[PDB]
């Protein structure tokens, strides 16, 4: 078919960059992050919607791999919070080892230039994001070290309220959007060059974050509220504020977010959602955010990572222009990452002060007096 | 004086690379890692043996900055261990922010080439080490992420026993050297290219580590047992095994480790210790490991980081050759770091398997059966 030829050409010209895939958590579930002598299975998985053969088959140009850990359940809240931090480092570790063990297929990327260079070399540009601020254990220092390990977006919440923001699917509300900590964290995320992700957050938290942020944000895996009413989907109000923000809504393949009866969800519904957003806030503010391996089953025609050429062909069949399809595929999320990094560079260049953690006093006045007395003795020498 | 001229020339020709300085912990003690608008104080500190003016004055070529946190004290052992991990990320964060805020003085280095390029540019080569395996919270994944954040050596213990090895100053003994975990960790440290540090560890743990390690190790801040008997100092047995290992003993300025009465300790004693080691196991296996800011007061003539030219002049005055003084200054620790990284590259190139953490099962058999059934349904499509 001419359109299947056309779709194949587009996937080779520009990278399709998917906003969210939980394949690293499947590796934790199935292998317990032990991939030594498991290439046969990593290429052909006995579970899930992602493996390295099907990843090549679907012609995916890049991927934000999710370093998700569950919301802490432990009765003792300090343990659970600190446990989530250790589990995050385990998930970042297995993502890096997955990329390093398969350098013909996957190449690490943390920027627009690194995405392109990976795509020129014929590899999947492998970026990283964390799904929730519960993962940092209330530590902005830890968050900067996660950025240093290659994390390029942070979902403000998952399916639990944290000290910074409200999740969508939990009632009652705790902060009613963002807390004062949350607001102050928006400035720090903009300063460090961390891309803000508004998936899983409440409608009020989205509205506040979109007004406050000095850099463009994303929805790594969310759909449209008007087509299908759900707490996880984006309202027409927040879609317009996303336009002012210059952000991108990366459309989700979650069946619950596409249709009222989950088993009726299809590829055509995903295309309806992309076109709705593209019509109302322009095709330069829409993306693709599958959420593959964050679900058991996908929509009809989007069952796994091999199905991306059908999505590209489907968009072209509906009269979306080549140039707009290239934007939806990946050019838009590349622009947001580039603008997030430009805003961070110009804020850092202006000498903006970084957010610091609240630390305990390690020394009492006796120890501090010994230290000052010792210093003055050295000054006399 | 001609020898002071000579000492100044050597410090400009090759970098003096100090093995251990706890200045990042002083920043935690004094500022609580909040250095915003504190340059006046960072250049001229009201406490401690290190600031940025005196660092320039002493002509130090490089420094392994310590990312030490205390041994966990909390009754609940899971909390204390996980707390130490979060505090480690806080200390790595402030070290990176210290370097990034003062790029004229400090430049980050993690290799031989990066040390030299920093030194050619006229900056202190800023490397990182952690003082104890309590800091990783029993997580090899976390340890690899610490390596990724720029940590290039790990002291196996501080002043507490951990799951991997015995500290020197704690009795009774727990493992009697290294545990089985400890032995297995030696292979992983060699594979990843992490430099093993044997300061603070027991004599038996040193003997076992020196025999087991496939790469050269260091003592980041230890002295000589024969000159001054102390659990922290290196025995003649372990000095010989360090020679076979191709490692380096970086001599400590701790007064307790140099003399029986601490107040009698001097610069001359530090030179006695360097010459003792250099005479018996060669000058290519000796270094300088001040431990500045790990003590209240230093030896006479080595009161702070400005005193390194007196140490270089003192070594030349005692008939140690220029070439051997250059070795003791930094060429030796550069060689060990280069050999550690060469061993890691050749082990990684041979496809050696990495050590993995023991993880909990996240899925039961019901969830795993749903996943395999779902996969087979997709195979039929
Ligand atoms: Cl609208
Ligand atoms: Cl704390
Ligand atoms: Cl000997
Ligand atoms: Cl675990
Ligand atoms: Fe997810
Ligand atoms: Fe999700
Ligand atoms: Fe120390
Ligand atoms: Fe120490």
Swiss-Prot record, chains A, B:
Family named by the database record: Belongs to the metallo-dependent hydrolases superfamily. Peptidase M19 family.
A GO BP term here is:
mycotoxin biosynthetic process
UniProt KW keywords: Dipeptidase, Disulfide bond, Hydrolase, Metal-binding, Metalloprotease, Protease, Virulence, Zinc
Entry-linked InterPro entries: Metal_Hydrolase (IPR032466), Pept_M19 (IPR008257)
Q: What are the names of the required cofactors?
A: Zn(2+)
Name it. Answer: Dipeptidase gliJ
The positions annotated for binding Zn(2+) are 20, 22, 131
Instruction: Output the PANTHER family linked to this UniProt entry.
Output: DIPEPTIDASE, MICROSOMAL DIPEPTIDASE
Q: What does this protein do?
A: Dipeptidase; part of the gene cluster that mediates the biosynthesis of gliotoxin, a member of the epipolythiodioxopiperazine (ETP) class of toxins characterized by a disulfide bridged cyclic dipeptide. The first step in gliotoxin biosynthesis is the condensation of serine and phenylalanine to form the cyclo-L-phenylalanyl-L-serine diketopiperazine (DKP) by the NRPS gliP. GliP is also able to produce the DKP cyclo-L-tryptophanyl-L-serine, suggesting that the substrate specificity of the first adenylation (A) domain in gliP is sufficiently relaxed to accommodate both L-Phe and L-Trp.
UniProt EC number? 3.4.13.19
| Disulfide bridge positions per record | 71-160
Q: Which SUPFAM superfamilies match?
A: Metallo-dependent hydrolases
Q: Which residues of the sequence carry a binding annotation for substrate?
A: 158, 232, 291
Q: Name one GO molecular function term.
A: metal ion binding
Cite the annotated pathway.
Mycotoxin biosynthesis
Please list the reactions this protein catalyses. Answer: an L-aminoacyl-L-amino acid + H2O = 2 an L-alpha-amino acid
């Amino acid at each position: 078919s001419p359109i299947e030829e056309q779709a194949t050409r587009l996937l080779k010209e520009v990278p399709l960059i998917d906003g969210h895939n939980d394949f690293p958590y499947m590796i934790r579930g199935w292998f317990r992050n032990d991939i030594n002598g498991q290439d046969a299975h990593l290429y052909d998985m006995p579970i899930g919607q992602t493996d390295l053969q099907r990843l090549q088959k679907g012609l995916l140009g890049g991927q934000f791999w999710s370093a998700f850990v569950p919301c802490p359940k432990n009765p003792d809240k300090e343990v659970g919070s600190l446990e989530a931090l250790r589990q995050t480092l385990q998930q970042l570790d297995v993502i890096h080892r997955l990329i390093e063990r398969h350098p013909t297929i996957l190449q690490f990327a943390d920027s627009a230039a690194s995405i392109w260079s990976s795509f020129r070399a014929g590899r999947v540009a492998s970026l990283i994001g964390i799904e929730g601020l519960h993962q940092i254990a209330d530590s902005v220092s830890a968050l900067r070290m996660l950025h240093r390990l290659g994390v390029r977006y942070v979902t403000l919440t998952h399916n639990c309220h944290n000290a910074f923001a409200d999740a969508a699917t939990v009632s009652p509300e705790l902060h009613g959007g963002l807390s004062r900590k949350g607001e102050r964290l928006i400035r720090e995320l903009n300063r460090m060059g961390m891309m803000i992700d508004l998936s899983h957050t409440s409608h009020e938290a989205q509205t506040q974050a979109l007004r406050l942020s000095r850099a463009p944000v994303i929805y790594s895996h969310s759909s449209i509220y008007s087509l299908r009413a759900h707490a996880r989907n984006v309202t027409d109000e927040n879609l317009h504020l996303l336009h002012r923000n210059r952000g991108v809504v990366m459309i989700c393949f979650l069946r619950e977010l596409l249709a009222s009866e989950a088993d009726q969800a299809t590829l055509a519904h995903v295309i309806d959602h992309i076109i709705y957003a593209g019509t109302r806030i322009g095709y330069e503010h829409v993306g693709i955010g599958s959420d593959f391996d964050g679900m058991l089953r996908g929509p009809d025609g989007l069952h796994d990572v091999s199905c991306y050429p059908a999505l590209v062909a489907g968009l072209l069949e509906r009269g979306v222009s080549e140039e707009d399809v290239k934007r939806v595929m990946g050019l838009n999320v590349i622009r947001v990452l580039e603008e997030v990094e430009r805003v961070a560079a110009e804020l850092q260049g202006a000498g903006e002060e970084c957010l610091c953690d609240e630390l305990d006093e390690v020394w009492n006045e006796d120890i501090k007096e010994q230290l000052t007395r010792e210093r003055e003795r050295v000054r006399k020498l």
